[PDB]
């Protein structure tokens, strides 16, 4: 009767929700939350993430509407479906992800009226290069001192998907709450369908970019790669020959040998290809 | 050790690494580098004080 | 996963960020920037900038959060 | 005068979250909910939606019902989280429409003056075929013929802001195809941009060989429409001839150079360190 490691289903809208309610007020931590299905003892799933309406206070109990949410919640019994919650969402900002001093009484306010009502942390300012530094959290009571935190029993996956970070074992780690793992729902009726509607275009395969700037761009690259080449001349026929093999390792340049060499050729090479390629298929199709 | 810089982490506050050598920005006024300007014949006359 | 590798770098480098200045170097891959908000830094460096460019106090690119040489 | 639309991400897949929702109970195989906009300029954008019960009889297809005290009870609560969000208009699903999409437009038109819909295709999704758009338009029908609704298209598309591909991206993660592509990723954008074109013209085919073996009454606009394609194609003379060899040769032989001096004498070097390299372990071996 204790947890062992739970796996938190996420679906595909459910995060679109995040970022988007996230990225709303960034100045003013967003709040609201968050709506699934207890399916089992360790698994948890959430498919559908409302938000809530925020007030002077911000991310605290204070912000959460009980008469608004059971409106709410009764208008979406009719349509698509009833569930519980599950747990609830805000957003840190100004730092990483941690349980502030009170997102930690919201939580045991969660976990005494819900069952354990994980909370999810999401970083709307970091979310930018190609990731997302989104976790959720579950807080351990405080009677388990003189037993080792996150009873785990039966698994192996717990060195996988995050190593705790030092600037995450500094506030409450692990001896307040401990870390979750979160996997990704996908399925088909939705992967292939966002990728044909997004990274997709028709009568943009087979344009052809006319040449006023098309050949404008075969001269500009000549000139620098030409004094690359003089350079690369320059250092070929210098060949210093004392101690050869640590005055190279100790001199690297990183811009001279083949790094600036077959670079842009590469790149003007596979372009005029392309343009020459589309213009004689043309000319076979149109007449 | 006098005068030794150290790498502190910013999140703990805790010790990263000794630092290599001392305090001295602000060199480039100093170590002239370049040795020829002048020679010593070009001057003449003020031997006592040569 | 090498062309992502290089997606990677270029993408990590081209955002707004702040403006700081070289100040030492330790070693190859981490050297010794201030920014310009004072509060002197050690980070580390990328290997596509050029190592024989930062002899003096020259004005170098910062992360916001990384804070390292850009 | 809406030039195109431009939805996010959100409620495409929302609309499969709510088929998916009904399909335990429901019969109506179609999902008609409302669509929510930030009308800016001309050009038009739908950030979030949401659904409502809606059924309709199969029995004399006239029969139908909207449940607008949900909708004015759920666009008042998302007006007060974000009043940014206003009605633009609504949508379905279902490439076969149903005739009651008319007398659906013309009630909430007391809503939106320049009300919208948006046919998205769930089951559909094989070939290419994003989301359809329509306008709301009362004219007689053209001249000489009688007066109708007559459902005026506009062209749609996905756009895709910031703050969203990051959670687009990391969804992905399975073949993700990279920018620019090293020539393969070219010649398949050619191969299904002409998959697309003989597939249109599959279906015009098809649409010549019904629009006159007695079906239905032609439409004078669309013959004309189709002759100003055929005997308005360019052809082929001396004038194109002696500029096409004029400047293949020109971005050719670039090409040329680049790739049989620069590649190759690169692969010598590369020669020269190695066999180098393999000669001076070999006399220091023993
Ligand atoms: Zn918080």
């Not at chain 1, 409106?71 to 969402?89: A, C, F, I, S």
């Amino acid at each position: 009767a204790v947890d062992t490691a739970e796996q938190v289903y996420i679906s595909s809208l459910a995060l679109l929700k995040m970022l988007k309610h996230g990225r709303a007020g960034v100045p003013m931590e967003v709040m609201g939350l968050m709506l699934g299905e207890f399916v089992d003892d360790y698994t948890v799933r959430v498919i559908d993430v409302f938000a809530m309406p925020q007030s002077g206070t911000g991310v605290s109990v204070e912000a959460v509407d009980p008469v608004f949410q059971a409106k709410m919640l009764d208008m979406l019994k009719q349509t698509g479906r009833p569930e519980m919650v599950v747990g609830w969402y805000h957003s840190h900002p100004g730092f990483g992800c941690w349980l502030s001093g009170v997102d930690i009484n919201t939580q045991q306010s969660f976990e005494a009226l819900s069952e354990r009502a994980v909370a999810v942390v999401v970083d709307p300012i970091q979310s930018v290069k190609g990731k997302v530094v989104i976790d959720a959290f579950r807080l351990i009571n405080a009677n388990m001192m003189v037993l080792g935190h996150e009873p785990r029993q039966t698994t192996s996956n717990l060195g996988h998907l995050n190593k705790p970070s030092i600037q995450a074992l500094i506030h409450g780690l692990n001896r307040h709450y401990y870390s979750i793992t979160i996997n990704y729902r996908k399925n088909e009726l939705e992967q292939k369908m966002l990728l044909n509607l997004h990274k997709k275009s028709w009568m943009e395969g087979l344009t052809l970019q006319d040449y006023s700037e098309h050949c404008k761009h075969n001269e500009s690259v000549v000139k620098e790669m030409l004094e690359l080449a003089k350079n690369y001349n320059k250092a070929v026929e210098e060949e210093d020959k004392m101690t050869p093999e640590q005055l190279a390792i100790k001199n690297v340049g990183k811009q001279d040998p083949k790094r600036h060499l077959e670079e842009h050729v590469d790149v003007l090479m596979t372009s005029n290809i392309v343009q020459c390629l589309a213009a004689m298929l043309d000319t076979v199709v149109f007449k | 050790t006098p005068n030794c810089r150290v790498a502190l982490r910013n999140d703990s506050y805790t010790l990263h690494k000794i630092l290599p050598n001392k305090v001295d920005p602000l060199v480039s006024l100093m170590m002239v580098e370049k040795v020829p300007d002048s020679t010593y014949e070009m001057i003449g006359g003020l031997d006592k004080q040569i | 996963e090498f062309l992502h590798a290089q997606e990677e770098v270029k993408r990590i480098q081209s955002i707004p960020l702040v403006i700081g200045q070289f100040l030492e170097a330790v070693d190859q891959n981490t050297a010794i920037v201030g920014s310009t908000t004072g509060s002197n830094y050690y980070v580390r460096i990328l290997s596509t900038i050029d190592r024989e460019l930062l002899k003096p106090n020259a004005s170098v690119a910062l992360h916001k959060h990384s804070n390292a040489l850009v | 005068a809406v030039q195109k639309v431009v939805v996010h991400p959100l409620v495409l897949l929302s609309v499969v979250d709510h088929f998916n929702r009904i399909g335990k109970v429901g019969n109506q195989k179609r999902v008609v909910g409302v669509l929510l906009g930030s009308w800016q300029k001309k050009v038009l954008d739908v950030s979030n939606s949401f659904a409502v019960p809606f059924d309709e009889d199969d029995k004399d297809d006239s029969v139908w019902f909207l449940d607008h005290d949900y909708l004015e009870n759920m666009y008042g609560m998302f007006k007060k989280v974000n009043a940014r969000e206003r009605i633009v208009g609504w949508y379905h699903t279902g490439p076969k429409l149903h005739k009651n999409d008319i007398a659906i437009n013309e009630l909430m038109k007391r809503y939106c003056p320049n009300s919208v819909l948006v046919i998205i295709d769930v089951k559909p999704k094989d070939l290419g075929l994003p989301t359809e758009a329509y306008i709301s338009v009362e004219e007689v029908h053209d001249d000489g013929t009688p007066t109708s609704k007559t459902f005026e298209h506009v062209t749609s598309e996905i756009g895709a802001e910031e703050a969203e591909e990051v959670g687009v991206e990391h969804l992905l993660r399975d073949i993700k195809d990279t920018t620019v592509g090293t020539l393969s990723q070219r010649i398949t954008n050619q191969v299904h941009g002409l998959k697309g074109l003989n597939s249109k013209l599959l279906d015009i085919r098809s649409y010549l060989e019904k629009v006159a073996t007695g079906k239905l009454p032609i439409n004078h606009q669309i013959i004309y429409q189709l002759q100003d394609v055929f005997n308005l194609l360019p052809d082929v003379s001396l004038q194109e001839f002696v500029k096409a060899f004029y400047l293949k040769t020109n971005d050719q032989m670039v090409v040329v150079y680049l790739a049989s001096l620069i590649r190759s004498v690169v692969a010598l070097h590369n020669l020269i360190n190695n066999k180098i390299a393999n000669r001076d372990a070999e006399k220091k071996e023993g």
